[model samples]
Target: FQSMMTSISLAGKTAFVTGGSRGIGAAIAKRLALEGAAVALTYVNAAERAQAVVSEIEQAGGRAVAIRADNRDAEAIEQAIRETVEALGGLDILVNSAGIWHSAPLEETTVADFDEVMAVNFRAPFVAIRSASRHLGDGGRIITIGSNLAELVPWPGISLYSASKAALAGLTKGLARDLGPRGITVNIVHPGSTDTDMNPADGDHAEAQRERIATGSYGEPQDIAGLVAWLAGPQGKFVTGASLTIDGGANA
Candidate 1:
């Protein structure tokens, strides 16, 4: 029933979704397809999950493809962006969703872990936009999937993840300014406690987390996906450089 509204009618658009193998990425890919956009999704490690999402989109009469690319590598990300354009025509929308998460006492957090998360979660998106911007025409849109932890949630032990997302917020604003003149809107979507591999709804404190939210529940992949699709749609064109949080009122 919920799927009816978000089935995006991207009749003439093409989208590139990174880390589209599972969770929110997959959900976003599917949602975009439902709206009639051809999608080229990137997955580094989850081939099966990527294929599954592609199959699902195909079954729905939407064009979808899963390609492997290590987002952390600048050249690789650039190549992937170009390939997606080549496969599905020029890119109309770009979703930067690839990231890594790690938990550790701040004092015990290794330099390696710090750099790794930053490289994947934040830096990669920077590179992707630089590469994809050439292909994205005047009405292009760029969306980054961030975490509400940057704005409101205070989860311990995942300091690096939080910082990385915060960095993305800054990047979003910077990109919005940099690309705004080009008629491309750049924004970040920060999800609250959602059902995902990164933060499972079945995990400890999940119930407490839900209770704390103003909405009294956790969010689903499709919830965030729907927001992204809306942002990519025509209505979201005027919105740019905003850090929108869809965390069930976690901040409230």
Candidate 2:
């Protein structure tokens, strides 16, 4: 059987995944590695886990590295992208997976909260895209990890987080237009009720969440990563400036 019949191959490409130390980020990094893409993963803390990710890929005979770059610091994140290009030879894909999630009443949420969430969740991706753009040539891919909350806020007291994720939609469209001529694809993925360490599949509110999804189940990190990997490969060349949602039909 032709290997690529299962899915498009990403062999020889290099990808930079932010916040690659934990949860969805780690899975995305590993998925790309399996698809044959060299990876440079950035994390703020969790040095042990970040290194573990590198080791995980290395054990599989793939090229990988872990770097410390706090998303809140613009310089650090930008440098992470540049270093990824240097470390992996050239940049072909950038996955903006680092994000901040805050749920609080409008009155209780302070300016400091707004700034931190916007800086990490919204602004960092904006900066990373600009930095990645400098090196990503024709056939490059930029896939961002967003949230379904950006469009349908099913719960209250999440306005701040919702707005931050919503901003990327506009950024994706604008950059897709700017980069289309260069053969780059810019898109965002919105995941809902994804099970991770923070929000485990069998967590306290699992049943409540499952009840809302049409599939009556939660999504695993691999589910999101598979979609991202597709976007990074040849199959996703035609998909640009789109906000694809993968929530087990939770947003329905």
Candidate 3:
């Protein structure tokens, strides 16, 4: 039974995923690897978790690498991309999934905290796409992770986080135009009410979040991964500069 014949849609491709130690980032890396791409994922800490991801990929007969790169240092992201390309031969997909959520009132938010949030959520991806564009050729893909909060705040205490994600929307649109000539597609995905360590479905705020979601439930990490896999596949060739939402209609 040749089960793999149906898969391998992304065979021979190389991907670099930032913030791949856990949660959505880990899911994306695993999904891409399952699709037959040689993947390189970066983590700030959680070396064991990062290695766990790598181990799973390799055990499943897929190729994966784990690197340590703090998002605050954008240069490290650029270097990680370089190493990924060298190790995997070439780059085809760039997934900027590394991010942090800031839940604080705008009034009391300090400049350092603001900068830290922006540095990880926005600036790092800016550096990533800029560097990855150089190596990505025709049909290359750039998928960034954003939040539905960028479009809908719904409440206070997240101005910095909202601002950072909104910035990625602009960057994705602008880069879609800039990279059009090379056939590189740039887009962003905005997710909502997902169950993860940062925001678990059974957490203190889970009920409040479910009430806001149209589906009245939280999404699994694989839900986002499936959407990303589609965008990274052939059907996504015509799509660019769009913010695809997989929020279970949270925005609705």
Candidate 4:
């Protein structure tokens, strides 16, 4: 625990996290601030909530900015990345945490639904990564918050969501290869049954979901944030081209 506490620090880093207004993304944004990085986060419509996060960080003597950028818009995403670099001095880490979750049976799913899901879950990150890559230097970090469903889809109606996230696994691996020679590490994280506003632990499927996890409980956003903090620090330097699961053994 002491080593874990001491080794993780982002004192000189700058980061941009998408969807940082709430849930897992908000947790990551706060934790990154606590670790000493100047962070810029994107929110689609929660302008008030986004600014609250920024105020909270600033109250603690950290630097943070909340930008309004819709994930479905490619040009807007690129501009947000550029804004982060301009606002924070330079970019050292990029976290793609903005995503949508839609559940519809195969027959009920429409082409519009599939396209919107893909735009946010896959294409936005691809664009953000490409834009952020221009500013990230050696020792840079790139992380995508994926879902456990990407590897093991245990239920129906999530085919579209699963497919969208699964694409990120390939993106992470390919980007890791592309960025390796420059010393930038890229990785994907899959979280299972996390307690967020969109998927609360006490929601309708609580019992069934709890039963499926080996730990028999839903994970906190901070649980995922802890792992991300490690990856952005000095200790996780050698790790790259990997899919790290923080899912309480759901796939086991």
Q: How well is each residue in 131-223 modelled by candidate 2, as lDDT tens digits? A: 999899999999999998888987779888899888998899998999999999999999998888767889587787788899878889999
Error of 2 at 66 (Å): 0.2
The order by descending lDDT is 4, 3, 2, 1
Model 1, residue 35: displacement in angstroms?
0.3
Better of 1 and 4 by TM-score: 4
Tell me the deviation in Å of residue 166 in model 2.
Answer: 0.9
Candidate 4 C-alpha lDDT tens digits along 1-252: 867666788987999999899999999999999999999999999999999999999999899999989998888989998888887899999999998889988999899988888989999999999999999989999999999998999888999899988999989999999999999999999999999988999968877778889978899999999999899898989999899998899888
Estimate the TM-score of every prediction.
0.94, 0.96, 0.96, 0.97
Cα lDDT tens digits, model 1, 155-246, are 67877888899999998999999999989999999988889987798858687678778977788999999999999987787999999999
List the candidate 2 regions with Cα displacement exceeding 4 Å: 1-7
* Prediction 4 TM-score vs. true: 0.97
Q: How high is the CA lDDT of each candidate model?
A: 0.88, 0.90, 0.90, 0.92
The local distance difference test score of model 1 is 0.88
Q: Compare candidates 1 and 2 on TM-score and give the better one.
A: 2
Clash totals for all candidate models: 3, 0, 0, 0
- Global local distance difference test of model 2: 0.90
User: How much is the lDDT of residue 245 in candidate 1?
Assistant: 92
Q: Give RMSD to native, each candidate.
A: 2.8, 1.4, 2.0, 1.5
* Candidate 2 positional error at 113, Å: 0.5
Q: Which residue pairs in model 3 clash with each other? A: none
